Amino acid sequence: HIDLSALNPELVQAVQHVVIGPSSLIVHFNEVIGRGHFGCVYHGTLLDNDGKKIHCAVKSLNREVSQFLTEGIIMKDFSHPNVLSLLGICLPLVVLPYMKHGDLRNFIRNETHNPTVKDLIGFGLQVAKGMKYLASKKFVHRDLAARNCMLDEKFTVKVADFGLARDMYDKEYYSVHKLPVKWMALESLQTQKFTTKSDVWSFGVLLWELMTRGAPPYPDVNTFDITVYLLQGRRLLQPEYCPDPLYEVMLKCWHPKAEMRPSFSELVSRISAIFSTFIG
Template identity: 45%
Template sequence: MEYQTMGSLQRVLWNGRGNTYYSNIYGCSKFTAQQVLRFAYEVACGMTHIAELGYLHRDLATRNVLVDEHFTCKISDFGLARDVSLIREYESRSQGFLPLRWMALESIKDSVYTTHSDVWSFGILMWEIVTLGCTPYPGISSMILRQQLENGYRMMRPKHCTHEVYRIMYRCWREPQAFRPSFKELCQQLEDLIFKAQNYVDLVNIDERLFKGLTRCIPGEKY
C-alpha cells in the first residue's frame, strides 16, 4: 500500500483547528470549506466502490481514513471488514472493543451489520469532519447512548454548518435503515454542494467550545 504522508484524516482535522490552516484574516488559508466537503465526498466515493464489491467496513471513522500529500482521502483499516457479497447482512459475535459512537442503532442492539449501517457510520464521519475531529455525541455517556438513540435522539446541527450539509448526515441516521441514502447517492449530493461553491461550512466562526467536549469511555468501547 502506498505511503500516506499526512496520516489519518482525524489528525489532519485536529491540526486544522484554530488559525493553523483556516485563516481568512491573514489570507493564508490552506483549506477551504469546499475542501472539507471534498474529504466527505472522497470517502463516500471510496465506500461506493467497497459496497459495490460486496464488502462491509464496519469501522468507518476519520481515524481509519488516510490522507496523502495532495490531501486525497483513502479508506483504510479493514480489520473489521466482512465479505457479504452473497448475503445481505452480517451478524457479529465478536467480544472485542466496539466503536459504539460510530455504530448504527441496529448494530448496537442486535449486532447486525449491512451497507446501511456503514452509511450510518458515514453520517458520524461527516459530523467529525464538520467539527474538525470532535468526538461524536459530546457530553453523552456511552452507557446511555443506546437508550438515547432508541428514543430518537440524533446529534444536533453544529451552528457553523448549514442545513444543506446537516440534512445529508441526518439522513444517514434514519430509521428504518432502508430509508437511508446509498453511498452513490451521497456522492452525488456532496458533489452538487461542492460544485455550487458556497460557504456551507463556516470554519471561520466555528464554536471552539466543541473542541473541549469530554465524553466517558467505558470498557468495551473503541475510540
C-alpha cells in the same frame, strides 16, 4: 512457509503478485509512525520489479496462513483513488502506501492546516466515493470513522483500516460489550450485525466530524448508554459551518430504517451538488 495446495485453486496464481520478497523491502524499526492493538507501523522503502524507490508504511502484527493470503489477495484486487491499497505482504509484514498526512481526524484537528468548508465537504465527497467503490464490491467496512481514513501527499482522502490494515488505532472509542458504539447504527448496537446501510450511518457521523473539524461525537454520553440516548429521539446537532442540505444528508444517513438510508451512490450525487455551490 507458503503452502499453495491449502489455497483455493483459483487463487494460486495471484500469490506471486501479493508476496513481497524480503530483499525488496527495507523497514525502519527505529521510527514508529502509528500504533495499533495488533501492532506498530514503520517507515518502509520498497523496490519495484524494475527497481524504483517508493515510500511505504509497514505494519507489524506483533501483539490460518492460507486464510491470511486470500485476505491479502482479495484486498490487492481492490483499486480506487479513495481506497487505501495493499502493496503486498512480506515474510508477516503488511505493506501499505505511505500516507504523508496521516489520518483524517488528526489532520482536521491540526492547528497548522486550515481547510475551508468546501475542502471539508470535499473530504466527505472523497470518502463517499471510496465507500461507493467498496459497497459495489459487497464489502462492509464495519468501522468507518474519520480516524480510519487517511490522506496522501496530494491530500487525496482514502478509506483505510480494512482487510489486513484493520486495527484499533485509537482505543478510546471502542467499548467491550470491542465496538465503535458512537459510530454504530441503532440496529447494529442491538444485534451486532453490520451492513452497508450501517456503514451509511457511520458515514453520517464522519460528515459531522468533518464539519466540527474532529470533535468527539456525543461527549456527554457514556459508551453503551448511546442506544438509550438515541431512542429518546436524538441526533448529533448541526455544526455551525455545516450547510443545511448537508445536515439533511446526515439526518438521512441516520434514518431509523436501515433500508431508507441513502446508498453511497446517492451520497456521492447529493454531496457533489452541495460541494459545487461553494467557492474556495
